[PDB]
Design a protein around this ligand. Structure first.
Ligand SMILES: NCCCC[C@@](N)(CC[C@](N)(CCCCN)C(=O)O)C(=O)O
Ligand SMILES: [Mg+2]
Ligand SMILES: [Mg+2]
Ligand SMILES: [Mg+2]
Ligand SMILES: [Mg+2]
Ligand SMILES: [Mg+2]
Lengths: 296, 296
């Protein structure tokens, strides 16, 4: 299978006066490239995929593709939807506009059955010829792609090569790689990046790497090179920031931290997301002081 | 406050060859009217709001408004979204096209904070002058509108008049009505319609009433008159069908039952929803044989 693995960043989407700040978006991607990241994910959950229009979503994918061209950094485009026809349209767009692969979150809200999830992802994978990474995040979607469904999709659909797991369930990570060791398990939960990698996971799609791309990329590369002592050392050092970035729903804390570090111009969200509480604003700012934050 | 209460139906959306069957849709609404229902909810969760286009969503609202003219039956239009700008657009459409009020599900997937939920619903409520019913269903959205937030919205926004609770939490139902007895608590969980109504709830937005509108209507009107013996008897009789209609994710079982009763011509869903398993198809049919199902 063709694969996209390694240290990857779920890019925040900066806004200016209610619109996507496209110059800021490209500048932040260049900063990821300069700090060892292997791939970027435009317009995942961290990118406020829910509140972008379909046109803005496509613009962000195009910016990522253009900014990474000529570098060895890949674009794994966010393309998920709770409607299969919408996810297929996003998948086809990402393929036609030069993305290296797509990330596709399990349908939120409408709670498909396992049979429905299988048919959903099969429709997506058959619509393109680029790699497709499944994405399980039951705390947000209300459904879980079971281990059996993931493995069947991996074995039945050429392009489906692994899953981004954001479920806090290391038992399921063992289950997945014990029964299908050929798939690419990707960590979608920063605090447990190292445990997922040490069990044979092959990358991360990180929120924290927006702020600390050098540290997340180093953790991942230490682990892939089997230097577990050094990978665990960074995972341990990052625990405090990894947890504080979820003190309110992602991406409210990471955007707050990016603003506090001077990496984006304005702390702007699209409703229903909004600024953190004053208390959480202070906690994020306090935790950040312990870390060296790279500039541009 | 202007209110929409009583026995209400979360309408299924029938499809024919992948398009909304608009003739079937009107016929199903007329059947609800003739069987004692007080209001209909086009394109809620049960109506596959996630997989309709915005244009199809608007078409269904219009069919409902047209079909209810000249009757006592109100149209509480589904207008929720995980993006505030989309929810405001739907609210404004429902207002301008003659809906009596709107239902507005808590944002799914992006997990707004309580502050964000407050700002989301305040924007929606200020965009129209018709009644707004909040809708809480954490199992589907990944978030929940806390009691404090519901009550603050009820007290702060003239047209927010209550909440449809689908959370299986009768303690919260006591909490809501003990601290703000003026609000309209609406059951969004058929199995516990009678317990919610007997604690002072003022209506239901029902899945089961798609199939058994006369029974849900009678249960609700018995309860509203404090004829609790009769209301409980119907709630008890309905328990088996109420539970089997959730043996797979709603609306897969209710659409299956409507098809099994000849009330819709095709057992068609939009992916990622799909037909139930053969075993659940047979289980649904077996439970249906115990109930008296009205025709057209
Ligand atoms: N990634 C950019 C598009 C975002 C669109 C949407 N806000 C809504 C998607 C939708 N399927 C629209 C249905 C419209 C008719 N009700 C949904 O709200 O579920 C989402 O997927 O979260
Ligand atoms: Mg590299
Ligand atoms: Mg996605
Ligand atoms: Mg009227
Ligand atoms: Mg709604
Ligand atoms: Mg009667």
């Amino acid at each position: 299978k063709n694969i996209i693995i390694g240290a990857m960043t779920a890019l925040i989407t900066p806004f200016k006066n209610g619109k996507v700040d496209e110059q800021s978006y490209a500048r932040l991607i260049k900063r990821q490239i300069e700090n060892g990241i292997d791939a970027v994910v435009p317009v995942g959950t961290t990118g406020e995929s829910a509140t972008l229009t379909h046109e803005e979503h496509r613009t962000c994918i195009e910016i990522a593709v253009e900014t990474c061209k000529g570098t060895k950094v890949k674009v794994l485009a966010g393309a998920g939807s709770d409607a299969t026809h919408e996810a297929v349209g996003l998948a086809k767009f990402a393929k036609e506009h030069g993305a290296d692969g797509i990330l596709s979150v399990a349908p939120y809200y409408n709670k498909p059955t396992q049979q429905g999830l299988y048919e959903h992802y099969k429709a997506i994978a058959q619509s393109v010829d680029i790699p497709v990474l499944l994405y399980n995040v039951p705390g947000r979607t209300g459904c879980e792609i079971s281990t059996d469904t993931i493995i069947k999709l991996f074995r039945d659909c050429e392009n489906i090569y692994g899953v981004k797991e954001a479920s806090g369930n290391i038992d399921k990570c063992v289950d997945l790689l014990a029964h299908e060791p050929r798939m690419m398990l990707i960590s979608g939960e920063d605090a447990i990046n190292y445990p997922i990698l040490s069990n044979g996971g092959k990358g991360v799609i990180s929120v924290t790497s927006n702020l600390l791309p050098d540290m997340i990329s180093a953790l991942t590369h230490f682990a892939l090179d089997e230097n577990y002592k050094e990978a665990k050392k960074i995972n341990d050092e990052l625990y405090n920031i990894n947890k504080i970035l979820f003190c309110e729903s992602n991406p409210i804390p990471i955007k707050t931290a990016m603003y506090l570090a001077g990496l984006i111009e304005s702390l702007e969200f699209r409703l229903p997301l909004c600024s953190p509480s004053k208390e959480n604003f202070a906690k994020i700012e306090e935790v950040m002081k312990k870390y060296k934050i790279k500039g541009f």
